[PDB]
């Protein structure tokens, strides 16, 4: 028993039209929006009692809702401004007090940008293990680097022997400004992948760390010189090393 | 308003985890606590009524203390799997909704069995000017570790999941040495050449 949200990451231009999505298959008469930005909590937005019966939360300046059936719950920006980047959430709940427990999606992650120029898809690199590190412990880390994006919209995988792996690997919890006073700063992610010296020192071994990022689509238009920032992967790979 | 306290708490495994909250609205008479894993939206973990001043569930427990208007959320032998924000609501037979506090981020160290502070650089797999420092075990606050000139010319993250932290560059005279705090860091910090 699952809410559903979609889609997962947004990058809009202000001025633009948005429609989040929410799903719901439990029978639940309650859904709401919310939005979550650093510092304040979730801030509801709107919430909604039965089809056609929407009332305003604490925010409901700049945004619009609509539920016509009992399973979706769509929020709706006219016209997006910067200030409505954030990450947003539906929920449910059997009825709508707040005695009952609210089910959230697994949120969208909106960035409305003053202009799609801003749009950087990363750079990607991999580092070697260290030397000393294989002598001092008979393990070898291997490092990732993603780094010049912009919206913070990636997410980073390994790939060993053309195999994902989660063994062994520590990525940082969320990508971090590349210059935190900017609003339309880049980002950089770093991960960490470690695997035994004998591993790494078997140069049939492949390592690559697989970066996609969530960019411009179809519908954008792009009359730039530099390639057009559109969903795309960014890998970089080492191989192994006697 | 429902008020939590602190904004953000680093904790190591094993540790005894203690969550503040208080209230100003004495009309509230129901208090869920909601755990959000990185990444994922938030969920239901653990709630208590006003009529009473305690709920147990394994690991964590709402003491609640109606007079203050106060209560918290303990989590015994804290697990790195309980990094999440943690967030307390309240709402009253007479309050429309559910009133969120703003939340309280919770961080835990996994233990580290045999500490082994060390810092290496790492080269590029591709031909360039680019290196990593690697610091294991840099935690045996946190982000002291870093010098933050002015001067080094350098970028810095920490992963608290695996006591590790890196701080990078473009430039070719870029030593570890100068990237790091050397009178704070774990005093037998190894730094192999």
């Known amino acids: 028993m699952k809410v559903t949200q979609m889609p997962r990451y947004l990058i809009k231009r202000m001025g633009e039209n948005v429609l989040l999505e929410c799903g719901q298959d439990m029978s639940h008469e309650t859904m709401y929006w919310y939005r979550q930005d650093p510092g304040l909590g979730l801030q509801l937005i709107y919430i909604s009692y039965d089809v056609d019966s929407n009332s305003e939360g604490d925010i409901p300046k700049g945004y619009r809702v609509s539920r016509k059936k009992r399973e979706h719950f769509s929020l709706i920006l006219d016209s997006a401004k910067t200030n409505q980047t954030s990450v947003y959430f539906c929920?449910?709940?059997?009825?709508?007090?707040?005695?009952?427990?609210?089910?959230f999606g697994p949120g969208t992650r909106l960035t409305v940008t003053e202009d799609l120029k801003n749009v950087f898809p990363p750079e990607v690199a991999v580092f070697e293990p260290s030397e000393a590190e294989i002598s001092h412990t008979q393990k070898a880390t291997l490092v990732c680097l993603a780094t010049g994006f912009y919206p913070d919209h990636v997410e980073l995988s390994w790939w060993v022997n053309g195999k994902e792996v989660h063994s062994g690997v520590s990525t940082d919890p969320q990508p971090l400004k590349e210059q935190p006073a900017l609003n339309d700063s880049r980002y950089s992610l770093s991960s960490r992948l470690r695997v035994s010296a004998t591993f790494w020192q078997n140069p049939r071994n492949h390592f690559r760390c697989q970066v996609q990022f969530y960019g411009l689509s179809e519908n954008d238009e792009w009359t730039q010189d530099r390639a057009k920032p559109v969903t795309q992967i960014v890998s970089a790979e080492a191989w192994g090393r006697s | 308003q429902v008020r939590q306290s602190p904004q953000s708490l680093t904790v190591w495994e094993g540790e005894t985890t203690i969550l503040n909250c208080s209230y100003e609205?004495?009309?509230?008479?129901?208090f869920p606590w909601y755990q959000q894993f990185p990444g994922e939206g938030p969920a239901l973990l653990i709630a208590?009524?006003?009529?009473?001043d305690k709920k147990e569930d394994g690991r964590f427990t709402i003491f609640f203390n109606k007079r203050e208007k106060k209560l918290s959320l303990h989590i015994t032998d804290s697990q790195p799997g309980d990094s999440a924000t943690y967030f307390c609501?309240?709402?009253?037979?007479?309050?429309?909704?559910?009133?969120f506090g703003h939340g309280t981020i919770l961080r835990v160290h996994p233990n580290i069995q045999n500490p082994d502070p060390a810092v290496y650089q790492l080269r590029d797999s591709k031909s360039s000017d680019k290196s990593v420092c690697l610091f294991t075990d840099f935690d045996s606050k946190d982000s002291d570790v870093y010098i933050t000139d002015a001067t080094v010319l350098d970028m810095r993250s920490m992963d608290f999941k695996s006591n590790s932290a890196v701080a990078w560059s473009n430039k070719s005279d870029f030593a570890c040495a100068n990237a790091f705090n050397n009178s704070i860091i774990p005093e037998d910090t190894f730094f192999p050449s």
């Open positions: 609205n004495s009309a509230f008479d129901y």
């Open positions: 609501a309240a709402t009253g037979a007479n309050t429309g909704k559910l009133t």
């Open positions: 208590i009524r006003s009529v009473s």
């Open positions: 929920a449910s709940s059997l009825a709508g007090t707040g005695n009952y427990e609210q089910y």
